[PDB]
Structure formats: C-alpha cells, structure tokens
Symmetry: C2
Subunit: 411 residues, 2 copies
Amino acid sequence: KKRVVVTGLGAITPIGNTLQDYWQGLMEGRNGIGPITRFDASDQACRFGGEVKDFDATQFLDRKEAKRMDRFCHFAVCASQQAINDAKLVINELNADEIGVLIGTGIGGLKVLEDQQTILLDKGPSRCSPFMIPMMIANMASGLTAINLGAKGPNNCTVTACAAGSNAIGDAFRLVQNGYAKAMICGGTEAAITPLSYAGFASARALSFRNDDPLHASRPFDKDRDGFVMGEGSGILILEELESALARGAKIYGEMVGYAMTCDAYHITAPVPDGRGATRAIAWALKDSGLKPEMVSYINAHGTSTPANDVTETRAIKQALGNHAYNIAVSSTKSMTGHLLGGSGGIEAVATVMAIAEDKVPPTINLENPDPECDLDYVPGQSRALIVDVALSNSFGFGGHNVTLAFKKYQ
Amino acid sequence: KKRVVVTGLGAITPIGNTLQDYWQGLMEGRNGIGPITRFDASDQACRFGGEVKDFDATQFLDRKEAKRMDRFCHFAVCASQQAINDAKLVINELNADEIGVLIGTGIGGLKVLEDQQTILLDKGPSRCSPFMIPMMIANMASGLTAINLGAKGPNNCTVTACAAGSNAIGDAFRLVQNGYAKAMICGGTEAAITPLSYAGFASARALSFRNDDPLHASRPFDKDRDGFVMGEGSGILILEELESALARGAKIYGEMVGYAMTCDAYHITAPVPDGRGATRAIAWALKDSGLKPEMVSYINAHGTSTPANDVTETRAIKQALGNHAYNIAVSSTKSMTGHLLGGSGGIEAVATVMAIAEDKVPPTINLENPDPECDLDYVPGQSRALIVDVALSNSFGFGGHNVTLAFKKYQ
C-alpha cells in the first residue's frame, strides 16, 4: 500500500472563509451561529444557524461559471482552489490523469430544487431552467471542481448524510493507497440552509429550538442540548502519494493512516443504544492504521449536540479506547460551526489535520454541564496546547453510517 | 488482492420485475417504453418513459416500513432481497459485520422533495412531514437495505448521475478485493419519473421528444436519435470474496475483475469530442483486470441515445480496442429499458453478468440506420448467441464521470 500524506487544506466555514481564518477561529472559540439571513425564517421552528458570511464566489470564480452553479458547488470549488494553492500543486497535462476529485455532500443543490419546483407550480414545467439538473445533482461539486482545476483522475461523490465528507476523504485515501491516483482533492460541502431543509429537520425535531439564545444552542455533550444547529460550508484536503509529494518538496501536515466504515443496521436516523457500530468504526480505523488505542491523542468528535448522539458517541469512544478514553482530549467543533452535514467531515478533517501539525486542539464551546454519561475531557471553553501524535475524526450520520478517519504525524 | 465473484442478482425494471423476467425481456427485445402514467405529463415536452409496471412494494416489505420510504428505496430494498435470495446468502449475527451495502442513485427521493415543497408553499413549513429527510436523501437506499437485510459492514452511497450504479459496484468491488468486506450488496436505483425531473431534463433538451412514437424513441446509435428516454428501477449484485463463496457452495455467475474511473474535466454535461476520458476508462478497466483488449467479447454500452454520447462512445471503444472493436458485440439495453440514470449501472451490470453466464447478448432494439460514425455491431433487433468470456459495462454520466466495469467467466 502506498503511503498517503495531507499536503493541502482549504476551508469555507461559518467562522472563517480561509484555512487561516477557520483555524484562528477554532483557536479562539469563535461562534459562527446567529439568526438566519439567507432566507426569511420567521415561520420556522428553528430560526438560526451557522451561515458563511462575507463570501463572494465571483471573487474566485469566472462570473458565468459561478452563475451556473449552486452555493454548495461555490463552496466546494473555492475551498478546493484554496487546498491546491496551499499545497502548491501544479496540475497540467502531464499529471492531470493521476489527480482526481472526491467531494461528498448530504443534500446537494436543494436551493435549486426549491426554486424550480416553485416555478413549476406557478408557471408550469416549460418555464423551468435548462440548467436545473447540472446545478442540482450532488456530484456537481466534484465535477465542477475537476473542470476548474483540470483534474482528470477518478471523480466520485459519496452521499452519506453527516458522513459524506468523511466517506469522501476515506475513499480518496484508498484510491491513493491502491495506486489509482497520485493525488486526490477530497472532502465535503453543504449549502442546505434553506426553507425546505429547515422545515424537514425541524419537523423531525432534529434541530435545536433555542431561538431565544442562538449563540448557546449548539452545546455538544451538555445536559441541556436539544438538537443540532445547522451550518454550511466546505472543507477540502489534498491527499497525495508520499513519494510524489516528497519529489516536489510538498508541504506535509501529517499522514493519513486509517479509515473504517460500519453500519448499525438498526434504525435509519436513531443510533443504536450500545453504540456497537460506532465502537467498531473507531476500533477498526485504528486496526487499519496498525495503531493501538493507547496511541490516540485527540478525537474530533461527531458531537452534533443531539440527545442521542453525544452520549452514544461517548460510550463508543470509551468502549473502543478503554481507560485511555479518559486520558485523551475530545472536542466537537460543531459547537462553533454548527453541523455542516455533508460538509462536516470535510471541515472536521481539516481541523483534525491542523491539530496534528499545530499540537493544539480546538474547544467544545458552550459546554457547561455535561450529562453524567458524557464524562470525558471535551476541551471546554478554550483551545489547548497538546502533543497531537494521532488524531481521529468521527462521523456517525443519518442512514446508519459510522465512519472514523485516522491521521498521525508524518515521520 | 482477494478475488471477487458475482453470486447473486436482483432487478426491478421497465421490462421485468424479477431477474428472470428482466433477462427474458432482454432476450425477447421487450420494449418497456410507453406514455407516462405515474403523473399527468400533458404539460411536459416529453410525455413517455420506462416505468416499472405491476410492482407493489408491500408484497415484499413491511407495510409501515414501505410507507416510510420513497419509491427509489422500494426498488433498492426489493431488488436487494432478490439478490440475497438468488445467492442463498444467509446473513446472521455471525457474518453481519463482514457484509455491507453500496447502492448508488443519481437523484434519490425527488418525489418527496416535490411533494414537500408543494406543501411548504401551500401550508407553510410547519406542515412538512417529519419523515421528509429520511425519505428524501440519496443514502437512504443503502441505509434501508442494510436495516432490512441485517448487513452491518461498510455502508456507502455513490451519486455520480448516470454512473452512480457503476461506481457503487466498482467501489464495492474494491472493498471485497481489499478485505474490508466478505460480501457486498451493491448496485443502483432510481425513481425519478416525476414532473420536476422531466421538466429539468426536458428544459435541458436532453430527453427525446418523439411523443408521436414513444415505442421507437430510444434508439441508441441510430441516425435519428434525439435524446435519452428516462426509465426507473434498480439492479443489484452480490459481490463476494471467492474463498467465502466457495466455502458455502455459492452460485457463481462470473468473476468481477476490473474497474476504472476517469474524468474529462471538460464540460459538466457534454462529453469531450475525442472521447479521451472514455477511452482511458475502457483501457484502464482492462489493465486493472490484467486483460488485453483482444480478450473482450461483449460491451454493454452506455448508449443513451443522445446525439453526442453514442458517437463519442463508439469512438472511445474503437480507440481502446483498435481493430478488435469491429470483432466484438456491443449493445445498449437502454433501447429497451430507457435510461435509469443512477439505476442504469445496476441493471446493466446485471445484464452484463448474465451475458457472461448465458453466452447470449441482448439487442439494441429500434436501431435501423446508424450514423456513419456508429459503425460497430450493435446487435440490432434480436438477442444473439455468443461466447461471452469477457464483458465490459460502460457508464459515462453527466458530471464528467467515465466508468467502465469488467467481468469474465469464473475459472
């Protein structure tokens, strides 16, 4: 198996529109949650979320191209450009065939779907946009990114809800490990802060309804948590075969070493009580990496701030790491960014890789009183200096997908 | 690398609701195209398609469960049950963790999206169904199938438009090859015959507009083709590690041996003129299989019946196989079933595997006068007896995804 290193990172999030701003935000416990402005949410059960602010796609994309793509693609393409520039990776006719793209999303172009359905009902099917399909479908993020960057290698798209970005990075990792690509632009993206998305997640009673105090709604592991807080954005990584990376003197953040996927085959949205699947995902990600649980330094938890997830995940971490679970640092950055759904795995992988390189872990803000069963060190309040030798990123998404990614310092 | 054999097949299509009926239909050149009945298409530019007929999900699924899932999931779960029964694969607590699910789709639960958006606009967001999200998202096919069958292994979902089902099978193939699963229930599904889907594809001028003669609208490689004809359904394969399959005396249709993915990085919906990406996908699928082009016996073409695809694909086959391209059989089963989008790769993989085991290839019906550039043997009119030692299945989907799967007789 080829070794795979992370050579570039890009991010557009509710707390920063660049890698630097995003990381600084995480280090300062920046809060990206606030009242919804992208649409009139006055008639919604949840009226706040984590929106990307001060972002203009036309600053980075050709005007006509930007006009012909949805926001979820704006994020993916722009975050990918960031990653490529960060990596200083030059893509030309000579290496284009060995560089692919794998960007996942959970819902894709919902905005287009809503706008077009509204048109269909009001003006008739003949008035619908001829660009509806190529702007709406989930794989457009990967497709448009490849066209923008000139990547002609494997181009795929994983749609596994909250785990979309993690599965994308994991699958890209395999492509490089198995020699099907020398480099992969991968991660996740989501721009689902829309009336229908909010209506659906609110109806399912999945979203926090703390409209009176949006700044403290997202509180992973806290006893008073009442649902996740949606966010939007994209996180992208450049995974590269070690020899190729070294040959060009690539910047190296760390090495990706493990990936595991399991399924509870229990319930479509509710996690299994004993957290068996999540436990196995963590245990197998470690086995895939040839690492013992005691080697883990930090875990960027899924920690969505829902009653069921946070305690089940804590149980899984404790079952997978044993007593060592109490000797590591765990934190949910969703406390600051909100749950980016398909994009969560992307920006969280970015945060995890940065932690490995910076020896600093982001906090779980808003955590005041954790449930008795959420008794680990969740790095509450402020970021903390810590030697991060091995770090995991968890994604336990709706649909029953349990995914864990493992990274470690490059040596 | 572990060897992977196909031990089970399932299919729900416009020409048959079971593996047996689907194959018999293909062998008889059965036409599954007709006027739309699932909705009033009187105001649509295209008013026909390939619908699944006489299918009642409640005949195979628990009533409450069936009610809580969209048609694209009905197809996936039921076709998967078919495949498992065909394979005689018993899934229990002892092997559940080594059996996963990977079912792709191109659009997922569009029907739910349309019904709910209509409700939102007419009654307000508070009236939207609490089950909107878990019935609409693409990964629900894989998730619900895992729950129904008890599969606790890797559960993923590839959404790459026309290539969704092929990428799903290809990715599942890698999981078994690399030891991450002993068996995988994989394929594709689609149930996008809806007002909005038709409005979008018609607006893009992608669909055939031969409303006066629907039975002969889908005519791959024919000089008078004018767009694809949408179909719905699902095709599922059971991929299994060879030793495990032999140990239980599994039925073996053939061996999966190759998978390749490339990207034109050219246009989001239009194929590159020289068909370079498609050529490389075919060439690399063969290299992945350790097979020379001269070994190919049959190719189940993507052949969507669009002006651009059919000629570009023919060019790609000729560029990849050389003179041998004129000595093989090529056929597009979409001529009979229509283009199932995300489900196309699934039912076409089913047809390809059956061809290997039956030594018979399905025809490209409706083909009367092929363009001068579409000069291969497309098995027009009727099925034909032919020794099928090696067979490929092509999927060149919107988004720039070029995928080729390779199968061969098990020896």
